[PDB]
Enzyme design. Structure first.
Site, PDB file in Angstrom:
ATOM      1  N   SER A   1       0.792  -1.227   0.000  1.00 28.46           N
ATOM      2  CA  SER A   1       0.000   0.000   0.000  1.00 28.46           C
ATOM      3  C   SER A   1       0.827   1.282   0.000  1.00 28.46           C
ATOM      4  O   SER A   1       1.518   1.580  -0.978  1.00 28.46           O
ATOM      5  CB  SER A   1      -0.950  -0.002   1.204  1.00 28.46           C
ATOM      6  OG  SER A   1      -1.829   1.112   1.178  1.00 28.46           O
TER       7      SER A   1
ATOM      8  N   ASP B   1      10.500   5.997  -9.497  1.00 23.71           N
ATOM      9  CA  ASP B   1      10.092   6.493 -10.809  1.00 23.71           C
ATOM     10  C   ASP B   1      10.652   7.881 -11.083  1.00 23.71           C
ATOM     11  O   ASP B   1      10.930   8.220 -12.240  1.00 23.71           O
ATOM     12  CB  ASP B   1       8.566   6.507 -10.923  1.00 23.71           C
ATOM     13  CG  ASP B   1       7.965   5.110 -10.968  1.00 23.71           C
ATOM     14  OD1 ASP B   1       8.723   4.121 -11.054  1.00 23.71           O
ATOM     15  OD2 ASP B   1       6.721   5.004 -10.909  1.00 23.71           O
TER      16      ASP B   1
ATOM     17  N   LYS C   1      -0.031  -4.138  -3.342  1.00 21.73           N
ATOM     18  CA  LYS C   1      -1.358  -3.779  -2.847  1.00 21.73           C
ATOM     19  C   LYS C   1      -1.638  -2.349  -3.296  1.00 21.73           C
ATOM     20  O   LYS C   1      -1.376  -1.387  -2.575  1.00 21.73           O
ATOM     21  CB  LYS C   1      -1.428  -3.909  -1.319  1.00 21.73           C
ATOM     22  CG  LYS C   1      -2.835  -3.877  -0.737  1.00 21.73           C
ATOM     23  CD  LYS C   1      -2.798  -3.937   0.782  1.00 21.73           C
ATOM     24  CE  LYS C   1      -4.192  -3.821   1.377  1.00 21.73           C
ATOM     25  NZ  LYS C   1      -4.166  -3.797   2.866  1.00 21.73           N
TER      26      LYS C   1
END
Lengths: 356, 360, 139
Positions: free
Chosen positions: A253, A264, A278
């Site tokens: 999560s 990223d 998740k």
């Protein structure tokens, strides 16, 4: 006449099934079968089990669960819980909760069966990847405070180790002031291993501590009217300082949103294992006051646009845990934690590159 | 307002669910969930996958579900699956690229069915294994030489094995019995027999039972009440018979084992059986869909049902070798094999005391 | 054994409690052990059976019984055999050729009985075990 295929079937079920069955049973099992087959986290609160949800400061076991490849697994036992103390590890498949088989049991049913008062005992049957027979645990429950954030200096190096075992309401504040308390620091080891997630705004806030501009995380779906996109504001304090993030199969999560955002944006190095994946959000749909359903209403998407649940986070540096081979406050533990030694080593090359 | 709570739910799903889904999929995944939750063997044939019943290659395992997981009841003797090392109680975990969780009992069989030359892989979990086991097997035609009788050397008894209830089980056993007239006892090995057609279990039982009810199909609707009796006379009503059953014996194998047990016609030796006493039927949900669900359940001559409990034998003996205080000092048609099979030697021991008791 | 075994033991007086009857729990059978043929074996076995009306079977353990006097072997066997020869002493002199048979007063002519014997069964225990075996009275 389109919903006729359901009325057509219950006719055959009433008459040619071996048992005579009340339509009351037909309907509870009607709503169950559709919810469970569509989505793992899509569970069902019944015609009476709505209010069942003044709960107070109840107790529990301290494991976060999810369903991967159709079977229920423990995401990670929260550090300091009686389950963590008992020897539970991430990725362990729950097979029976108190001699009750979790077969076709929704994620929420398992959570509720383990939650209660701190003194109540509970049994769990588990299947681990490298064990000949299923493992049985006799453990007592407890209250969960969860001390999330502490910052420690990595001795004989200019770096410091910051651990976040969970996303409390005070994670961005405690992390920032922990950094504010260390002017002499030249690098960070951000340990997000075993962190099963938390609230989104503290994942966005923690990531905003290191990202000046750019997309940060987004909730998207078919309805573009309900399509949330969080970005980073220009007030990012630490835009230069090195940072090495650690993740494993217990990271889920929120911890994946910040780790994926740093990865990223090429803001940090991700060391450890592939995470759990998740990236779903569920929502309570109120069928009036008698019933409520939980279904995934949105998915999480990283600054790179990729989704989370299908793949999770694949770290830049893969390292299985264990001790560092040899040849015969964080010292010595670096040898007992080969993953931590790698995250420090990835910082050590960063400090070399910055010598310009 | 009979269906009021179901149409009420899908309303919220159509508008507030993450994915766009046609009501066609909403309903197929609704009815699949309804079918699966009621019964393990209740499976679903689709709007197109119905009338796809046209025919025999396959893997050669009979499968069933008792505690939510697909298992191999018993590998059919002589099939390439038996050759691979499959054993009873093994959980099937993956058939091809589909994790077998929430795969219907009928669907799993279809992935293993095909042409006899095609290969197939299966992932399996055994009760006492550390990691999943991978089996690469080629399919084949299933001839299954069902029944053979062999003389038990140094005893007047003979050993009768039935690996499955072929259309020729009563005939092959009967001709085997007439072909050894001086035989004084039977070892009826139904171990590893996962079942077969119902009429051959009753016919085999009628070969040894003079009178009484034999087995029943009973459901809540009494219009579906088939009652099998021993309406024919039994040729071999007196000779001793000791039946062997284990965790791989199911359905028909339990029907004959329970019938002999309940009538005190035989001694039942071995372990508790699997407990599959349901029979299904193809039900046409109009032309789009067809369901397979249990249309009747089996009841023993004692009145007890077969699915909840199976068959509990009179004499329990777990498998293994026959002990020998000097079994490695001596170390460098059924003789000596009895020493490698403790269960078979006990059934012989019960025949030997039976033949003694009949000496009155 | 690889080498001979040496035993340092002290002697003792031998009472030998021969017969006791026990019920085999969760079965209708009972276990009767005879480790030796005392002067009271037929009496104690019979009254042990008389004390158990509900019994449906017997396990007669004669293992480790090295023997005893003949009249208690004949008497114990007569408790289960209605008629027929029971045991005989024979030899070249037919004048000294004793033959014991069973009288019609056999109480338990129907009740099941399973006898146990091993390499320690000798003399009297073999006469009763062989008599029951040969009459097909016991297993």
């Amino acid at each position: 006449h389109m919903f006729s295929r359901f009325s057509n079937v219950v006719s055959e079920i009433e008459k040619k099934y071996v048992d005579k069955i009340s339509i009351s049973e037909i309907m509870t099992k009607a709503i169950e079968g559709l919810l469970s087959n569509l989505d793992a986290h899509s569970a069902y609160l019944n015609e009476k089990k709505f209010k069942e949800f003044t709960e107070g400061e109840r107790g529990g076991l301290g494991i976060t669960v999810g369903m991967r490849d159709g079977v229920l697994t423990v995401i990670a036992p929260l550090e300091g819980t009686p389950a963590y103390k008992a020897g539970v590890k991430s990725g362990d498949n729950i097979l029976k909760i108190n001699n009750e088989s979790t077969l076709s049991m929704s994620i929420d049913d398992a959570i509720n069966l383990m939650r209660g008062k701190p003194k109540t005992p509970i049994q769990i049957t588990i299947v681990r990847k490298n064990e000949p027979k299923p493992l049985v645990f006799n453990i007592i429950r407890d209250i969960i405070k969860l001390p999330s954030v502490y910052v420690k200096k990595i001795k004989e190096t200019p770096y410091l180790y910051v651990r976040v075992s969970g996303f409390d309401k005070n994670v961005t504040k405690s992390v920032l002031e922990g950094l504010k308390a260390n002017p002499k620091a030249k690098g960070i080891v951000l340990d997000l291993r075993g962190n099963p997630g938390g609230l989104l705004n503290q994942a966005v806030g923690l990531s905003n501590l290191f990202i000046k501009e750019g997309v940060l995380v987004s909730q998207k779906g078919k309805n573009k009217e309900e399509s949330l996109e969080y970005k980073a504001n220009g007030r990012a304090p630490y835009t230069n300082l090195p940072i090495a993030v650690l993740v494993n199969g217990g990271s889920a999560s929120a911890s994946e949103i910040v780790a994926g955002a740093l990865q990223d944006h090429k803001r940090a190095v991700i060391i450890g294992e592939k995470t759990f994946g998740k990236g779903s959000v569920q929502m309570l749909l109120p069928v009036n006051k008698d019933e409520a359903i939980k279904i995934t209403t949105a998915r999480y998407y990283l600054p790179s646009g990729r989704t989370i649940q299908a793949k999770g986070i694949t770290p830049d540096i893969v390292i299985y845990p264990g001790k560092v081979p040899e040849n015969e406050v964080t010292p010595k533990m670096i040898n007992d934690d080969i993953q931590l030694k790698t995250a420090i080593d990835s910082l050590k090359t960063w400090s070399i590159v910055d010598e310009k």
